[PDB]
Write a protein that binds this ligand. Structure first.
Ligand SMILES: *Cc1c(COP(=O)(O)O)cnc(C)c1O
Ligand SMILES: *Cc1c(COP(=O)(O)O)cnc(C)c1O
Lengths: 491, 489
């Protein structure tokens, strides 16, 4: 297996990076030999949409292509001030931060492997080799996929990733499998395409393998109006919005069912590196130790090559950058890339060169992992504050909650039936709108559990992130919400 | 009508720009009052696809609009605390108004700097804190105001409810209007010779393309009418096409630019057959001075620009695909669409469940250059410069052709706009096209084969004069002339 200490050698022993405009690359330029001793992935021809199968590809002097001259790109230099690994706080970066300059002629001047003229011009649909090498190495270091022909493709984000895998696998009048309570934007992306959602139940630890098996085993084309679904959308770590994180045992169990029913697993994992210690009343010995500490992903267990892993920089570095990637078997990744060519094309070149300078040249794999440890330490303090505030202010007779292990979401259950629903407007939805609107008026924003339902009126929940608000404000916000609850649940 | 000198006062008398994280806006917050006196666009309910009709407002993005009310604390949308973005300052060195050459910007360039806490320090209306966080599908209000103003000045559209929406690019724009206005089985209308990328974006959606004959000035109205009128008796198993894809200026790959008279003839035909006109205009500012063998001011420069389809859009049936690619940087992955509120809202919906918005890092760098430094003046100055650069490059390739290409078998008109030179050769004369491609590559010149661009007749070759040096432009043409002479004896 590839370790941080093996990367300098892998690069020495592998082909040079092409530093000209929009060069052909793949992950295969960057993968370690070990990868090719593993078996090949299963084929998925039968699962490709008619749209997706239809998609196709587009020393001498060239007057051939429509690439403009960098002369008429009016950016000579792009600089960013970034934290130097010791200190990662805004105060520390101001104090001791490093300035990274990307110049035109950087490649001629031997300064950089990513020229601003190249970053400012058109790119390929897989993204720059400069950034794809880091993403590929990162994928190998963290997940180490157990099949030979895995590949990364850079993205305009997981939102675009999900839209374009939905188009790749699904047709008008198909079902896909989601968790009881899922990401609203994921469902929001699926419906307009004619894709229906068959929900599968979950516990405090997330997706239940029994329910998944039960839905797929008990599937009748006639009643549902469509064929057995073969796509599973799931958030394994810090589930949106429950915050439930599957342990290794649940994931192995889920993978078995997917093997039996021949499912493609789409793991959307934005908070994968936000795994914290379990909450208590009130450190990683090495980078190998930190990586070992992370509960393994579906990609890690992906013996069959049936997994698409949606990764993003949004919850790790910046949602603004609109930069992510997909990890999957060559055949599906190749299909995704064609959709990018006639769509988003690639994430912004300025986004790519700023990320590459920080991740590749400055931080490296060490500095990046150092930053994710700090992000783990940060979100831990915030996780404690929201749970401490919840039980010190919230009415325990009306509100119930499990403290979360990973993510930035807190799931609060509300006994909606312990409020005067005997007379007048006895609609669970009515108490919901009331409880939400009563919260803004006492000055707190929360997410309505009903937005996250994949589709039944039982208990009601509220989603409360501990990422959005200043650490000091976390306590004040829950109190404000506690007050709202008491008022609304009163005379 | 809105002019550059009208802008400072439109701003003074308008609402404050929202400097918060992921704020709600629309062009309707930056459009001058004159717009609202004009009539409204026609309704497009009957042209909206099942997919697009079916789309809905993002409940999270919609809930973010709550972040506006002050002293309100958020446990809602998962937009991270700025402390978890490791970019303190982002700086960019760009040219001053007098000199735009890379060498001139090296010597006299300005360094614009975007820092976290700039909006609290009163340095700019765009905080890096905001740029680096999630944004709404329309793009940042700071960048959207500039593009909306720019759209008013240049095109100043003749209907009330026109709107702009920021973009991942014109390629992403075309992807989303095709899904918004087309279903499996339908036809769309494209020029006989057209952008290969535009045709490839449509084929896998099950959309067929109805070709329409061109001349030296582009799309022919009598051919468009003929195709659509003939649809009544000769349907191709599908309903009459209502979408026209058109590149009016420096058309790819012909280089044919429709003049105002030609755009007026086409538009009248688009009224008769109630067509929606999608005008892909990436080379609109690559318009050059006429070929032989100085735009006094901004006010003169805008006079000399051929009016776009949007400028004649009285019905509101025009969707304009704009991009910064051929004027600032293709790498920026930042464009926009202009159209009636109805289709732009549907466009915006799909963006929310798609690309979402152009990179915030792309947006703050474009806004800082365009709004804070150059201004509309500086940008027009830069566009005039661009005009003059491409003029010189157009000259170079045409001069070469007139000096090397054999008139016996080679025919060519000079381009008025864009970066493409379109060469016509008579195949019958030589002792069939594959033999002309490879032969020329044998002399070490590469050109693009016309057959690659079909949506019979004479054979053509597209030669771009955008990138290569004045030296290599001649050389390359000379290498072609000799290869053609060898193939045709
Ligand atoms: C926040 C979030 C996203 C956002 O992805 P981008 O890369 O920012 O487009 C996607 N999926 C889930 C589950 C999220 O929570
Ligand atoms: C170059 C070009 C574009 C540019 O598209 P973006 O995705 O905005 O870069 C669009 N249309 C045509 C016809 C082009 O030639």
């Amino acid at each position: 297996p590839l370790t941080i200490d093996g990367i300098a050698d892998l690069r020495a022993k592998s082909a040079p990076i092409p530093t000209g405009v929009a060069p052909g690359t793949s992950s295969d330029m960057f993968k370690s030999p070990s990868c090719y001793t593993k078996p090949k992935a299963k084929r998925w021809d039968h699962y490709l949409s008619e749209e997706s199968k239809s998609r196709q590809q587009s020393g001498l002097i060239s007057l051939g292509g429509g690439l403009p001259s960098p002369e008429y790109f009016p950016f000579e230099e792009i600089s960013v001030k970034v934290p130097t690994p010791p200190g990662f706080s805004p105060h520390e970066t101001q104090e001791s931060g490093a300035v990274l300059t990307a110049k035109k002629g950087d490649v001629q001047a031997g300064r950089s492997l990513y020229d601003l003229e190249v970053a400012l011009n058109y790119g390929q649909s897989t993204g720059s080799p400069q950034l794809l090498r880091f993403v590929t190495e990162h994928t190998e270091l963290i997940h180490n996929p157990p099949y030979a022909d895995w590949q990364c493709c850079l993205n305009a984000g997981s939102t675009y990733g999900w839209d374009t895998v939905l188009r790749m696998l699904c047709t008008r009048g198909d079902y896909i499998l989601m968790e009881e309570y899922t990401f609203s934007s994921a469902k929001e992306t699926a419906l307009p395409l004619g894709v229906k959602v068959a929900s599968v139940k979950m516990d405090a630890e997330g997706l239940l393998p029994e329910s998944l098996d039960e839905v797929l085993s008990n599937w009748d084309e006639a009643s549902r109006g469509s064929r057995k679904p073969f796509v599973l959308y799931t958030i394994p770590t810090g589930q949106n919005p429950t915050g439930a994180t599957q342990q290794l045992e649940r994931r192995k169990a889920v993978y078995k069912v997917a093997q039996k029913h021949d499912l493609i697993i789409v793991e959307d994992e934005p908070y994968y590196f936000l795994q914290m210690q379990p909450y208590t009343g009130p450190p990683p010995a090495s980078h190998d130790e930190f990586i070992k500490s992370l509960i393994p992903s579906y990609l890690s267990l992906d013996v069959d090559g049936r997994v698409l892993r949606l990764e993003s920089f949004s919850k790790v570095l910046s949602p603004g950058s609109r930069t992510g990637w997909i990890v999957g078997p060559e055949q599906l990744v190749e299909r995704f890339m064609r959709n990018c060519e006639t769509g988003a094309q690639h994430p912004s070149g300025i986004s790519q060169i700023v990320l590459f300078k920080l991740l590749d040249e400055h931080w490296g794999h060490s500095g990046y992992l150092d930053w994710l440890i700090n992000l783990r330490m940060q979100y831990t303090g915030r996780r404690d504050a929201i749970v401490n505030a919840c039980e010190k202010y919230l009415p325990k007779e009306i509100a119930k909650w499990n403290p979360p292990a990973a993510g930035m979401f807190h799931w609060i259950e509300i006994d909606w039936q312990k409020h005067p629903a005997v007379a007048s407007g006895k609609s669970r939805e009515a108490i919901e709108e009331a409880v939400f609107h009563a919260a803004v008026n006492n000055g707190v924003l929360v997410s309505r559990g009903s937005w996250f339902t994949a589709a039944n009126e039982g208990n009601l929940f509220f989603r409360a992130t501990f990422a959005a608000a200043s650490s000091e404000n976390i306590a004040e916000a829950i109190a404000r919400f506690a007050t709202a609850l008491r008022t609304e649940f009163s005379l």
